[PDB]
Write a protein that binds this ligand. Structure first.
Ligand code: CHL
Ligand code: CLA
Ligand code: CLA
Ligand code: CLA
Ligand code: CLA
Ligand code: CLA
Ligand code: CLA
Ligand code: LMG
Ligand code: XAT
Ligand code: XAT
Ligand code: BCR
Lengths: 196, 152, 201, 41
């Protein structure tokens, strides 16, 4: 589709048949079709996790402007006490995610081989793409046209960049992400990465 | 106290070594006027020696019976900066260099006279290849998985 | 072939055939023997000329008015040490970003001509230029004097090139005069006019 | 000149330039951060 840099010719292996294809591959990671097949799924999963992470880091902090709830900032939520110890929660999360990710992994190797429920054999997911399961995972039956996939990928890339910014800003500033925006909005021409 | 060693900041021999070096440096200073340039150089050397000893004291090194720092390379988390991290950095840099060299060698293998491109470097091709080595681990791992790394 | 030459009685280099504007066959070291270097050097000379003309105007006109007392602007040499509304590194970063966007599209036109002539946002707007280095269009050529017969274009481009060379020389001269004499460029001219025999290096 | 650029790509000249830049970078790095024995970060 569009060009990430006008005046430069798109690589041949990027034929534009994929959603969100702008011909951006200066270092040639996706020359091998198997590598491209793996990296598409990797990007999809990374973005889908990153958007949720950013939503969970930003929104539970914007409460200060509204004063509705009281929750510690994203880097202090770990130290708080909970009804169960860290070890038990970590073990349960490991046990569940092992099964979930092993089930997801098998579809990349042999598509259409994990479409049937293992206990109740009369329940199955309708056939679809590798990274787009559908069925019960799409309860509202929104049509997955190419435009929506491009929107999803753009939002995922933006959220990856946002999470990287969130991580980097806290390391050097020592505060959360929302107050950094307010500090910049206070005096824009003096509060930047150049402190002076 | 691994293997009977002691911290640098608690070692008396370390302070004795620092005092001896400072005293040796200060002896030559008395031969020159305070405003003379050699006096400034000697003052800078003394300040650098003091700063080096203070920095060695701050980093939590271990001293032996002779007042000299010793390096632990067994993998203890308290001493991961002596061997582990610089080793990983060196491995990354060496892999970058090797991958760049291998890619350049492979690229020119199909030319009519490949031996001519080895003594007279094709600068644009090398420059286009140089930046590619920044992600060498991923490329190497995927090449190994696809069976391309080893010649048949 | 019959054009005036920088060194009358000599033979101009083969790669300089007089087609380019402002061509006098001056290339003793042959720095533009192959065509790619010729095109790159032509673009570099055009850019240097325009930047130098802007700099010469901005150095000499403000300093002239300050001497006669209409304005009280500081010296161009020390104009970088004043304090402004923000730190100088912030201004440098803003300049770098803006001029990177501006010069980035210029780099693409040199490598692949005719590829950056369309507005990314409003496709209805286009640049009408056809030559590399002369973008044209309403943004850069509002008065419409940039298109016409080849003779007019050659005359205008020769005028621009010669004026740019003069501006480059003038700017370098002003810089070295302020380095050596330690006085404003306008003061040097008045000193020379006072005693032309002795007001000299 | 094409022939002048070709002579700059010969192995000894390129090696000399690369190693000179490398040595300058290393000398400057050691000047900024002298007496390094452990990685503190
Ligand atoms: C991804 C991810 C990253 C980058 C971090 C990184 C962090 N965790 Mg965390 N955690 C992450 C997922 C998880 N953590 C935890 C459980 C904890 C605990 C109990 C603690 C942290 C703490 C920390 C902070 C230590 C510095 C830092 C913000 C510490 C902290 O918040 O100190 C300021 C802390 O005490 N994490 C669980 C449950 C098993 C996770 C899943
Ligand atoms: C804003 C980001 C975004 C966008 C545009 C989409 C868009 C899409 N997703 Mg999706 N997804 C996202 C984030 C997003 N997703 C995240 C964060 C997760 C992880 C929980 C998933 C998990 C997921 C699954 C498991 C599946 C989809 C599927 C789909 C497609 C059909 C469903 C649909 O139209 O939902 C539209 C969604 C919105 C308009 C979001 C509105 C905002 C709310 C708060 C569609 C292209 C399905 C698919 O492609 O197969 C049919 C499918 O099976 N998504
Ligand atoms: C280095 C930063 C800098 C600064 C502080 C100034 C400051 C100034 N310039 Mg200026 N200028 C600059 C760079 C700068 N210029 C450059 C890079 C160019 C090219 C020009 C070209 C330029 C022109 C052509 C003119 C000014 C003028 C002026 C003065 C009036 C400002 C208004 O309008 C002001 C003192 C005007 C003036 O009358 O100068 C006193 C004027 O006519 N400038
Ligand atoms: C002696 C000074 C001088 C002269 C004679 C010219 C003459 C010319 N310039 Mg020009 N220019 C100059 C200084 C000069 N420039 C400087 C200092 C700059 C830097 C700001 C520019 C930046 C510039 C641009 C960006 C463009 C021109 C263009 C042109 C040509 C058409 C514009 C025109 O005259 O119609 C007035 C309208 C014309 C040959 C245009 C051109 O050749 O393309 C058709 C064009 O696109 N000039
Ligand atoms: C357009 C170019 C130009 C012009 C008009 C002037 C003019 C002047 N310079 Mg000067 N200068 C220039 C370039 C120029 N310079 C350059 C490039 C340098 C760096 C080497 C210097 C270094 C310099 C010093 C160190 C001093 C002057 C001084 C002076 C003034 C006294 C005359 C003199 O001794 O000149 C000497 C000029 C030179 C040694 C440079 C050679 C001349 C260049 C190559 C241009 C040649 C003129 C041009 C070909 C003729 C057509 C243009 C014409 C319409 C002006 C006078 C106003 C003196 C001063 O302050 O006066 C009180 C002084 O001490 N200049
Ligand atoms: C006496 C004056 C002087 C001063 C103050 C400096 C200062 C500097 N030189 Mg340097 N240099 C000098 C003379 C000087 N040099 C001479 C005479 C030579 C021989 C011609 C060199 C050859 C040289 C080389 C080959 C290199 C430096 C580099 C550097 C920078 C090292 C910091 C760095 O890498 O951060 C990053 C750089 C900056 C923050 C600003 C530049 C530093 C700004 C290094 C450098 O710039 O690294 C990129 C570098 O590789 N210098
Ligand atoms: C494989 C052998 C080897 C290894 C691992 C090292 C490792 C090291 N040398 Mg080194 N060195 C070596 C051989 C080696 N050297 C040889 C053969 C010579 C003689 C040419 C030197 C001459 C030398 C000097 C002159 C200096 C180092 C320094 C250093 C330290 C680098 C500090 C920094 O920031 O960079 C590092 C521990 C620097 C240091 O501060 O050491 C503590 C330093 O100033 N080395
Ligand atoms: C130094 C500065 C370096 C970066 C310069 C960026 C210049 C502007 C171009 C990048 C932004 C852009 O195209 O935004 C618009 C793009 C693309 O946004 C949308 O993405 C869709 C994906 O299916 C489609 O490609 C759409 O056509 C596209 O408009 O935004 C992103 O890709 C977001 C993440 C990257 C943001 C910029 C990072 C740098
Ligand atoms: C998944 C992710 C983040 C996920 C976060 C999650 C789940 C949760 C976060 C938490 O906050 C909560 C919710 C609650 C808190 O209490 C705890 C934590 C745990 C803190 C980020 C991904 C982030 C992913 C990023 C930033 C990826 C960047 C990739 C880039 C830039 C690649 C560029 C190129 O590869 C191309 C495209 C083409 C090549 O040719 C050239 C180059 C240039 C190499
Ligand atoms: C190009 C140049 C010199 C040219 C050199 C020449 C002739 C070389 C000639 C040859 O190559 C040929 C032809 C052919 C070869 O075979 C032989 C040689 C002999 C090698 C000078 C200036 C080149 C470049 C110049 C003039 C730069 C201009 C600077 C500007 C715009 C400054 C602006 C400001 O001054 C303001 C306006 C206001 C201030 O407050 C702030 C600042 C920022 C200071
Ligand atoms: C444990 C340990 C140890 C010991 C031992 C060891 C470490 C061993 C081994 C190791 C190894 C054994 C590694 C690796 C492997 C590999 C494989 C399995 C295969 C293959 C490979 C290759 C062949 C490579 C190559 C290359 C690259 C990739 C880069 C560039 C260059 C080149 C091309 C060469 C120590 C104590 C010391 C430390 C700690 C840890």
């Amino acid at each position: 589709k569009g060009e990430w840099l006008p005046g430069l010719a798109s690589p041949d292996y990027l034929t534009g048949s994929l959603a969100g294809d702008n011909g951006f591959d200066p270092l040639g990671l996706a020359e091998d079709p198997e590598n491209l097949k793996w990296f598409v799924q990797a990007e999809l999963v990374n973005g889908r996790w990153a958007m949720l992470g950013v939503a969970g880091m930003l929104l539970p902090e914007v409460f200060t402007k509204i004063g509705i709830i009281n929750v510690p900032e994203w880097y202090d939520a770990g130290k708080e006490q909970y009804f169960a110890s860290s070890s038990t929660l970590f073990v349960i999360e490991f046990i569940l995610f092992h099964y979930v990710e092993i089930r997801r992994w098998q579809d990349i190797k042999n598509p259409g081989s994990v479409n049937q429920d293992p206990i109740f054999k009369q329940y199955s997911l309708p056939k679809g793409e590798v990274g787009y399961p559908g069925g019960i995972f799409n309860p509202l039956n929104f049509a997955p046209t190419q435009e929506a996939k491009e929107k999803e990928l753009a939002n995922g890339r933006l959220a990856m960049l946002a999470f990287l910014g969130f991580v980097v800003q806290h390391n050097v500033t020592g505060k959360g992400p929302f107050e950094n925006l307010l500090q910049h909005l206070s005096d824009p021409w003096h509060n930047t990465i150049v402190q002076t | 106290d691994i293997s009977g060693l002691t911290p640098c900041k608690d070692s008396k021999q370390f302070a004795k070594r620092e005092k001896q070096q400072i005293k040796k440096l200060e002896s030559s200073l008395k031969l020159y006027a305070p405003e003379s340039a050699p006096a400034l150089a000697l003052n800078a050397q003394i300040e650098k020696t003091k700063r080096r000893f203070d920095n060695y004291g701050k980093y939590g090194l271990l001293c032996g019976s002779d007042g000299l720092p010793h390096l632990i390379v067994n993998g203890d988390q308290r001493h991961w900066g002596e061997f582990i991290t610089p080793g990983i950095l060196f491995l990354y840099i060496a892999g970058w260099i090797g991958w760049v060299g291998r890619s350049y060698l492979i690229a020119i293998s199909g030319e009519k006279k490949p031996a001519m491109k080895e003594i007279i470097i094709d600068v644009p091709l090398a420059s286009r290849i140089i930046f590619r080595g920044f992600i060498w681990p991923v490329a190497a791992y995927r090449e190994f998985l696809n069976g391309d790394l080893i010649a048949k | 072939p019959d054009r005036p030459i920088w060194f009358p009685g000599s033979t101009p280099p083969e790669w300089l055939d007089g087609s380019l504007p402002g061509d006098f066959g001056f290339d003793p070291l042959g720095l533009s023997s192959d065509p790619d270097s010729l095109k790159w050097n032509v673009q570099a000379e055009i850019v240097h000329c325009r930047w130098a003309m802007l700099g010469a105007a901005g150095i000499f006109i403000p300093e002239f008015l300050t001497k006669i007392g209409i304005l009280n602007t500081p010296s161009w040499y020390t104009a970088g040490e004043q304090e402004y509304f923000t730190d100088k590194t912030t201004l440098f970063v803003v300049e770098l970003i803006l001029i990177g966007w501006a010069e980035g599209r210029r780099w693409a036109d040199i490598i692949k001509p005719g590829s950056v002539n369309t507005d990314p946002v409003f496709p209805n707007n286009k640049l009408t230029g056809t030559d590399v280095g002369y973008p044209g269009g309403l943004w850069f050529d509002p008065l419409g004097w940039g298109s016409g017969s080849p003779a007019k274009l050659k005359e205008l481009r020769t005028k621009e090139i010669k004026n740019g060379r003069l501006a480059m020389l003038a700017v370098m001269g002003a810089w070295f005069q302020h380095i050596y004499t330690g006085t404003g460029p306008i003061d040097n001219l008045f000193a020379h006019l006072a005693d032309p025999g002795h007001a000299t290096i | 000149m094409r022939d002048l650029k070709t002579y700059l790509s010969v192995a000894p000249v390129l090696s000399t330039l690369w190693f000179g830049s490398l040595a300058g970078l290393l000398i400057e790095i050691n000047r900024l951060f002298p007496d390094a024995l452990t990685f503190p970060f």
